[PDB]
Amino acid sequence: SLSDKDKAAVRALWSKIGKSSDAIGNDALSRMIVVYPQTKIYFSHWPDVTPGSPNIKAHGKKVMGGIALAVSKIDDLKTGLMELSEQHAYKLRVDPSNFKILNHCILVVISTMFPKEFTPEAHVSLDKFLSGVALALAERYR
Amino acid sequence: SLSDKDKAAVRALWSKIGKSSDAIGNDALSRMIVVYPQTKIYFSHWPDVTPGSPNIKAHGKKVMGGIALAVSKIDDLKTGLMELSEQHAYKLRVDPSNFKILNHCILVVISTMFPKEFTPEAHVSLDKFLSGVALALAERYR
Amino acid sequence: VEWTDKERSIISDIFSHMDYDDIGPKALSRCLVVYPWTQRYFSGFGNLYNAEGIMSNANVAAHGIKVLHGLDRGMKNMDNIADAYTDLSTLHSEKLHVDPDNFKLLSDCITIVLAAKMGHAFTAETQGAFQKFLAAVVSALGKQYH
Amino acid sequence: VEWTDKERSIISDIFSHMDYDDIGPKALSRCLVVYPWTQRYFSGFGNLYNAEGIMSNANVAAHGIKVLHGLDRGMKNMDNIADAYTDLSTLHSEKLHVDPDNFKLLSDCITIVLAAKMGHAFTAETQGAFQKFLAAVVSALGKQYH
C-alpha cells in the first residue's frame, strides 16, 4: 500500500514533472510498441503501430491523463479508477500483464527526462504507485 | 480486490478442505522446490532440502497456517497479516516473486486433491485471494 | 532444449493416456472464467455470459479439444519445438492477433486440469516435465511476434 | 541469441561510452532501495538501513562497479553469452545462494540508470537492444540453478 511518505513522494514528483505529461505519454507508448511489439495486437485495428504517431501521441495523452487522475485519487485508486478499469475490461480486454510493461516504459521515460527528480526514493514510491494503479485497472476484470 | 462473492467462495472451499491443510502444505512446498529449484536458496542452511522433509513438513505447516489465518482475515489481509509480512520482510527477506510460485503450486495440489470442489469459480476466487495474500505479505518490504 | 530420457518418457506417458475430448474443453473453459480477458478472442463462439454457459458451450469445447491437439507436434518434435510451431505462431500473431501472455495462462489451466485428472499420480517430477514442455511450447508460440 | 548488426553496434556504442564508475554504484544503489529484499546478500557491507546510507556506502559503490563489469564478457562474446556465464552462474547459485529473480530487478535498475545518463540518446531502439542483451545475460546467470 502507499504510505504517507509514498503518497508524498509521488505528489512532489508529479508536481515537478506534470508539466510534460503529454511528452511522457507519447514517449512511453512508443517505447512500448517498439520494445514490446506483442502489445501492438491491442492496436491492430489501425495500420499505424508506430512511435510518435497521431494515434500513438493521442493514447499516451490519455494514458498520462489517467496517471494524473490516479495521483489525484492516490488515497483510493480502486475507487478512483473504476471507470478506467471498466473500459480496458469489458470493452478492450487488455491483458493485465501489459500494464506492468507500460509501467516500466513509464519509469524509463521519466528517467530519461527528469534525471535529477527521479531519485531512487522517488523511484520506489512511484513504482509502488504504478503497481497500485495496475491493480486498480484490473479491478473489473475478474 | 475480492467481492463478497469471492469471499464466500474462498470460505466455502476452506471449510471443505481445511482439514487437509497439513497434506496440502507439505505437498505444495515439496512441489515448489522440485519444479522451481532456485527457491532452494532460502533453505540452503537446512539439513533436508528435499520433499516431505521434517522442515518441509514444518514450513508447509506454518504456511498453510498463514492461509488459514488469511481466510479468517479475509476482510482485511493487510491488517490481518502485517505480523507475517515483517517476518518475511525484514527477517526472512524473500523476493515476492516466489509467492506467485508457491500460489501456483498450491492450486495444483488442491486440484490434485479436491477436483470436484476446485471448480473454475473456486479457482478464480482463490487465485484472486492468493494474490491478495502475497501482496499482503509484501506490505512491509519497501 | 535438452530433455532427460525420464522427461521424454513422462511426456510420452502423459500424452499416451491423455483424454483430449475431456481435458481440452475443461482447460479452455476454466481459462475463460479465471482469465476472462481471454474471452475476447472467441466472439463468434456465442454465449460467454457466465461460468455455466462457458462450461456448456460447444464451440468452446470443440476449440479446446483442438488447441490441445496443437501440442501434439511439439511432443512428437521434442528437439525442435521452436521450428515446429513457427507457422502457428504467425497465425496467432498476424491473423488472430492473440496476446502471447494468454499462452502462459492457458498452459496453467491445462496444467491444473490434467492435475485434477491424474491426481496423486501427478507428482512434482511429472509436473516439472509437463510445465517444461508447456513452457517451450509457449516460447515457440510467441517468437513470431514483432 | 541471434543478433542483428544494429544491435551489435548499439551494444558496442553503449559499452564504449559507459562510465562503469558512475553507473555501477548508482545502479546497485538504486537496486538496494527499490528492492530492499536484495539487501540480505550484503550483510557485512555496513549501512544498508536507508536511502542515504546505501547511497554513500563505499562497499556498494565498489561492488556495483564490479557487477557491471561482469556483463563485459557478454558483449565481448555476444554469440556465446550463455557459456560465457557458466562459472558465475555456478558461483551465484552454489556459493552465494542468490535468488536469480534479483538478476532481473538489478537489470532493470541498470537500464533505468543508463537511461538517466544517456537521456535523449536512450532511444526505443537502444532500450530494446540493451534489454535484449541484459535478458540474455540474466538467462545465463540462472542456468546452473538446479
Ligand code: HEM
Ligand atoms: C497507465 C495505464 C493506462 C491508462 C491510464 C490508460 C488510459 C486510457 C484512456 C484514458 C483511454 C481513452 C478511452 C477512449 O478514448 O474512449 C484508453 C483507451 C485505450 N487504451 Fe488504455 N490506458 C492504459 C494502459 C493501456 C495499455 C497497457 C494498453 C494496451 C495493452 C491500452 C490500450 C488502450 C486502447 C486500445 C484504447 C482505445 C483507444 C481510445 O483511447 O479510445 N491502454 N486508455
Ligand code: HEM
Ligand atoms: C502462503 C505463503 C506463506 C506463508 C503463509 C508463510 C508463513 C510462514 C510462517 C508463519 C513462518 C514462521 C516465522 C515465525 O513465525 O517466526 C515462515 C517462515 C519462513 N518462510 Fe514463509 N510463508 C509463506 C511463503 C514462503 C515462501 C514462498 C518462502 C520461500 C520460498 C518462504 C520462506 C520462509 C522461510 C525461509 C522461513 C523461515 C523458517 C523456517 O526455517 O522454516 N515462505 N513462513
Ligand code: HEM
Ligand atoms: C498451448 C497454447 C495454444 C495452442 C497449442 C493453440 C493452438 C491452436 C490451434 C491448433 C488452433 C487452430 C488453427 C486453425 O484451425 O486455423 C488455434 C486457433 C486459435 N487459437 Fe490458439 N492455441 C493456444 C493458445 C491460445 C490462447 C491462449 C488463445 C486466446 C485466449 C488462443 C486463441 C485462438 C483462436 C481465437 C483461434 C482461432 C479459432 C478457429 O480455429 O476458428 N489460442 N490455436
Ligand code: HEM
Ligand atoms: C546482471 C546481473 C549480475 C551480474 C553480471 C553479477 C556479477 C557478479 C560478479 C562479476 C561478481 C564477482 C565474482 C567474484 O568475485 O569471483 C559477483 C558477486 C556477487 N554477486 Fe552478482 N551479479 C549480478 C547480480 C547480482 C544480484 C542481483 C545479486 C543480489 C542481490 C548478486 C549478489 C552477489 C554477491 C553477494 C556477490 C559476492 C560479493 C563478492 O565477494 O564479490 N549479484 N556478481
